[PDB]
Design a protein around this ligand. Sequence first.
Ligand SMILES: [Zn+2]
Ligand SMILES: [Zn+2]
Ligand SMILES: [Zn+2]
Lengths: 207, 271, 89
Amino acid sequence: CGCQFTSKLEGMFRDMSISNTTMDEFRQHLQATGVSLGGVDLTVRVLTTGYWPTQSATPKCNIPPAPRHAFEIFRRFYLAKHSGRQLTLQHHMGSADLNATTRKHILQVSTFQMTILMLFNNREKYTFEEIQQETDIPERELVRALQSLACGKPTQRVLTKEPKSKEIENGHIFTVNDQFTSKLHRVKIQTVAAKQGESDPERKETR
Amino acid sequence: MAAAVRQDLAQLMNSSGSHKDLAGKYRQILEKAIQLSGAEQLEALKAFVEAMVNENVSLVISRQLLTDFCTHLPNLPDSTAKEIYHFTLEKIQPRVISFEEQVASIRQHLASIYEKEEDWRNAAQVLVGIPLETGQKQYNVDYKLETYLKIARLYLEDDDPVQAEAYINRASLLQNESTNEQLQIHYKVCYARVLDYRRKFIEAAQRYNELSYKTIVHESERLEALKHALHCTILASAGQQRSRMLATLFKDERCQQLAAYGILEKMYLDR
Amino acid sequence: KRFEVKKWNAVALWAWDIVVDNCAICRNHIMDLCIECQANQASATSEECTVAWGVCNHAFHFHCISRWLKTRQVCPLDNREWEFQKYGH
Ligand SMILES: [Zn+2]
Ligand SMILES: [Zn+2]
Ligand SMILES: [Zn+2]
């Protein structure tokens, strides 16, 4: 090809290069002490806005506490040793491992349901109203993220509810089941990425 | 009796129940703390602030009780309440991304208090700290314009151009979005003041002359703006633009009213 | 607690500002016109002279770096090196 979006790919790969350079320099940073904890095992990445698009709107959702501390530390570093540019927060991407606890099976949360798990860490037995009122949580993407732990789950359920039903209600309580059958210590719930057909909307807008 | 208030707050934090009942109990505790005075009231309100920012307390409960606390404080005079304002401003950092209306109100109140004690430097420092750009509260254009205007006005008497120049830049950036006519007039007055201050006496004279032929501006304020235009024109770099401005200013009769009437008469009529 | 977060794989986006209050080719300012236009009036039509932003985030008046690309040479910071990523501050 020529140079129209080959530069877009150049920047895309530049972003990965800068991400790994930042990863190794940050590893040197936490090798030299680190004061408090909360940065137990973190993987923060540096990507530019001119090569990774926003997606829809640059959302402004909330952040879980350990992720809050990680984002604050990364922002302080980027404003201290990479000054001249400020970060913008968005909510579409990422992942995390949720250490649950007869064995200790570690879960996986894709940056959306981990706010609900934050509210549960504070105190569980919440409901849809609790996670929609005190979270500043987005639209039905929230429903898809939440149904991952409860709806359509095999016999490794980690977020059980009393009103057993297919459709989602409002006043329904969440609990936890140990589920010793889930011997896997890195069980993940990959409800996202169900298809890759590129639904008409995005195709039409980019056309 | 601040220890009793702190113990009650700690016990209520671990209590389980409906949101309305907990909010009412916490509001009663806050009212009891306000009824105190001196160091006891200071420590009780500090404990209340610490409890509100605590992770355990509900989001709605925390935000609403901080709002009520911030509304009750202006009743207490300009005193150690300012110290607890600083303490609360420092306190809001784990939840500074969830709610910022309380932070913005605290910053505005602290800036007003500093302006009361002839302190534009510290009021400017406080009011700069507002995160207007974020949009996570999505402040309407009028509020951002008012905040930037206040910072620019504060910086004019603190005498620090660089940051006020950038703030005027951003106020102009978001300026062509706002609605209020009186706010626009105030912004134009402040911009003309900035132009007069920096070196832009000719541009300040132009802006003041443009604002002089207005209606909503007070006749006294219109006369003051015209006097500023006249003084800027006299002090401006003497050239073609200054000559044209002097010729234009030789038409207003309220120019003739002013004491510098003779001065620009001498300027334009050549001597 | 019953659930505890162990890892995180966040993606952090950033924006480029390097806000300053000066120019290069006209030596006046980021805003408030340039050498080739001087005043605000005299056939401006809402002042058709804005700030141009490059891919490297350097900021000039559009007219300034436009004539820079036109007058001396086009090779220095050509379409391969200098892009046009924004118009206005
Ligand atoms: Zn220019
Ligand atoms: Zn021009
Ligand atoms: Zn450019």
